[PDB]
Amino acid sequence: EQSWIPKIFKKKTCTTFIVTLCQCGRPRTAHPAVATVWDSDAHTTEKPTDAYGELDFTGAGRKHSNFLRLSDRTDPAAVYSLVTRTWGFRAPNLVVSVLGGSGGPVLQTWLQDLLRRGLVRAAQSTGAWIVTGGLHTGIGRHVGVAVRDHQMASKVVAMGVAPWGVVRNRDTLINPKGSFPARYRWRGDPEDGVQFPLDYNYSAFFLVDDGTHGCLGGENRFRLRLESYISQQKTGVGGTGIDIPVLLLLIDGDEKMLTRIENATQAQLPCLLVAGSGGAADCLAETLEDQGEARDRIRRFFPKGDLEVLQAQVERIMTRKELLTVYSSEDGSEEFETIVLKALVKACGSSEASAYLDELRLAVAWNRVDIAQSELFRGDIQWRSFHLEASLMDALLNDRPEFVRLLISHGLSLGHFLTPMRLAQLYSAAPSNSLIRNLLDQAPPDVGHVLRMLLGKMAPWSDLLLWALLLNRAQMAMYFWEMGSNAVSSALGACLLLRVMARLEPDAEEAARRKDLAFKFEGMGVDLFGECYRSSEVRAARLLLRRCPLWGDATCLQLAMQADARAFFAQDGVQSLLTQKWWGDMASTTPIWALVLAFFCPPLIYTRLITFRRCLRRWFHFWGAPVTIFMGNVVSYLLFLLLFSRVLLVDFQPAPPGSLELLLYFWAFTLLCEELRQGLSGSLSQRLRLYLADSWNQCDLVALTCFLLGVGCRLTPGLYHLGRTVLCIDFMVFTVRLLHIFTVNKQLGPKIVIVSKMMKDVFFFLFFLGVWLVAYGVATEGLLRPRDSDFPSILRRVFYRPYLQIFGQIPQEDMDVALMEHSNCSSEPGFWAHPPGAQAGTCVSQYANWLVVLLLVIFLLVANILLVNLLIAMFSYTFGKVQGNSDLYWKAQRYRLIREFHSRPALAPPFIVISHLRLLKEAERKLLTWESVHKENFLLARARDKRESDSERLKRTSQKVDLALKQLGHIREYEQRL
Ligand SMILES: [Ca+2]
Ligand SMILES: [Ca+2]
Start-to-end CA span in the chain (Å): 65
* 191 CA to centre of own chain: 55
Query: CA-CA distance, 450 to 470, in Å (whole number)?
Result: 10
Of all ligands present, the nearest one to the C-alpha of 344 is 1
* 106 CA to centre of own chain: 43
H/E stretch holding 39 reads none
Position 750, amino acid = P
Query: CA-CA distance, 235 to 362, in Å (whole number)?
Result: 13
Beta strands in 509-580 (DSSP E): none
User: Annotated binding residue at 171?
Assistant: no
Separation in Å, CA 910 to CA 258, 521, 635, 672: 103, 46, 11, 11
* Residue 801: other Cβ atoms inside 10 A: 21
Query: CA-CA distance, 892 to 661, in Å (whole number)?
Result: 38
The string of DSSP letters for 321-380 reads TTTEEEE--TTT----HHHHHHHHHHTT----SSSSHHHHHHHHHTT-HHHIIIIITSSS
φ and ψ of 161, to 5 deg: -135, 100
The string of DSSP letters for 635-672 reads HHHHHHHHHHHHIIIII--SSSP-HHHHHHHHHHHHHH
Separation in Å, CA 704 to CA 697, 716, 760, 762, 878: 11, 18, 25, 27, 32
With 0-12 CB in 10 A as exposed, 13-18 as middle and 19+ as buried, what is 431?
exposed
Nearest in space to 578 (alpha carbons), one of 849, 890, 938: 890
Distance between Cα 158 and ligand 1 center (Å): 22
Query: CA-CA distance, 69 to 67, in Å (whole number)?
Result: 7
Spatial CB neighbours of 155, under 8 Å, sequence gap ≥ 6 = 127
Distance between Cα 961 and ligand 1 center (Å): 30
Contact 131, 161 (CB under 8 A): yes
Position 587, amino acid = A
| Sign, Cα dihedral of 612, 617, 622, 626 | negative
Contact 112, 120 (CB under 8 A): no
* Residue 453: other Cβ atoms inside 10 A: 12
Distance between Cα 234 and ligand 1 center (Å): 10
State whether residue 56 is helix, strand or coil.
Answer: strand
Rg (Cα) of the chain, in Å, rounded?
A: 44
Distance between Cα 118 and ligand 1 center (Å): 21
Distance between Cα 907 and ligand 2 center (Å): 15
Of all ligands present, the nearest one to the C-alpha of 696 is 2
Of all ligands present, the nearest one to the C-alpha of 700 is 2
Spatial CB neighbours of 426, under 8 Å, sequence gap ≥ 6 = 396, 397, 467
Distance between Cα 672 and ligand 2 center (Å): 10
Query: CA-CA distance, 221 to 73, in Å (whole number)?
Result: 8
Distance between Cα 257 and ligand 1 center (Å): 25
Nearest in space to 524 (alpha carbons), one of 939, 10, 30: 939
Nearest in space to 71 (alpha carbons), one of 41, 38, 42, 103: 41
Distance between Cα 904 and ligand 1 center (Å): 72
The string of DSSP letters for 253-272 reads --HHHHHHHHHHHHTT--EE
H/E stretch holding 550 reads none
Under DSSP, the state recorded for 570 is T
Pairing of strands 204-209, 183-184: unpaired
Query: CA-CA distance, 113 to 334, in Å (whole number)?
Result: 8
Position 362, amino acid = L
| Sign, Cα dihedral of 465, 469, 471, 473 | positive
User: Annotated binding residue at 730?
Assistant: no
User: Annotated binding residue at 355?
Assistant: yes
Position 565, amino acid = A
C-alpha angle with apex 690: 689 to 695, nearest 5 degrees?
Answer: 100
Distance between Cα 521 and ligand 1 center (Å): 41
Of all ligands present, the nearest one to the C-alpha of 232 is 1
Under DSSP, the state recorded for 290 is -
Cross-strand bridge partners of residue 821? 834
State whether residue 747 is helix, strand or coil.
Answer: coil
Contact 844, 797 (CB under 8 A): no
Query: CA-CA distance, 522 to 652, in Å (whole number)?
Result: 55
Distance between Cα 231 and ligand 1 center (Å): 8
Distance between Cα 119 and ligand 2 center (Å): 69
Of all ligands present, the nearest one to the C-alpha of 233 is 1
The string of DSSP letters for 180-191 reads SS-EE--S-S--
Nearest in space to 261 (alpha carbons), one of 303, 220, 322, 304: 220
Of all ligands present, the nearest one to the C-alpha of 94 is 1
Under DSSP, the state recorded for 701 is H
User: Annotated binding residue at 924?
Assistant: no
Pairing of strands 246-250, 271-274: parallel
Query: CA-CA distance, 502 to 516, in Å (whole number)?
Result: 10
Q: What is the resolution of this structure in A?
A: 3.4
* Residue 782: other Cβ atoms inside 10 A: 10
Separation in Å, CA 905 to CA 579, 615, 752, 917: 19, 21, 26, 11
Of all ligands present, the nearest one to the C-alpha of 897 is 2
Separation in Å, CA 622 to CA 136, 441, 602, 606: 96, 57, 9, 10
State whether residue 582 is helix, strand or coil.
Answer: helix
Contact 185, 172 (CB under 8 A): yes
What is the total residue count of the chain?
978
Spatial CB neighbours of 488, under 8 Å, sequence gap ≥ 6 = 525, 528, 529, 532, 544, 556, 931
Query: CA-CA distance, 352 to 381, in Å (whole number)?
Result: 7
Beta strands in 726-802 (DSSP E): none
Query: CA-CA distance, 953 to 965, in Å (whole number)?
Result: 18
| Sign, Cα dihedral of 816, 821, 822, 827 | negative
User: Annotated binding residue at 149?
Assistant: no
User: Annotated binding residue at 359?
Assistant: yes
* Residue 411: other Cβ atoms inside 10 A: 12
Spatial CB neighbours of 747, under 8 Å, sequence gap ≥ 6 = none
Spatial CB neighbours of 98, under 8 Å, sequence gap ≥ 6 = 119, 130, 131, 132, 139, 140, 143, 248, 249, 251
User: Annotated binding residue at 122?
Assistant: no
H/E stretch holding 577 reads helix 572-582
Structure solved via: cryo-EM
Nearest in space to 76 (alpha carbons), one of 152, 9, 157: 9
Nearest in space to 459 (alpha carbons), one of 498, 490, 493: 490
Query: CA-CA distance, 702 to 239, in Å (whole number)?
Result: 76
Query: CA-CA distance, 916 to 912, in Å (whole number)?
Result: 6
Query: CA-CA distance, 429 to 451, in Å (whole number)?
Result: 18
Reduce the secondary structure of 877-928 to three states and give it as a string.
HHHHHCCCCHHHHHHHHHHHHHHHHHCCCCCCHHHHHHHHHHHCCHHHHHHH
Spatial CB neighbours of 698, under 8 Å, sequence gap ≥ 6 = 692
State whether residue 13 is helix, strand or coil.
Answer: strand
What strands lie across the sheet with 53-54, from one edge to the other? 53-54, 66-71, 204-209, 157-163, 129-132, 95-99, 246-250, 271-274, 324-327
Distance between Cα 359 and ligand 1 center (Å): 6
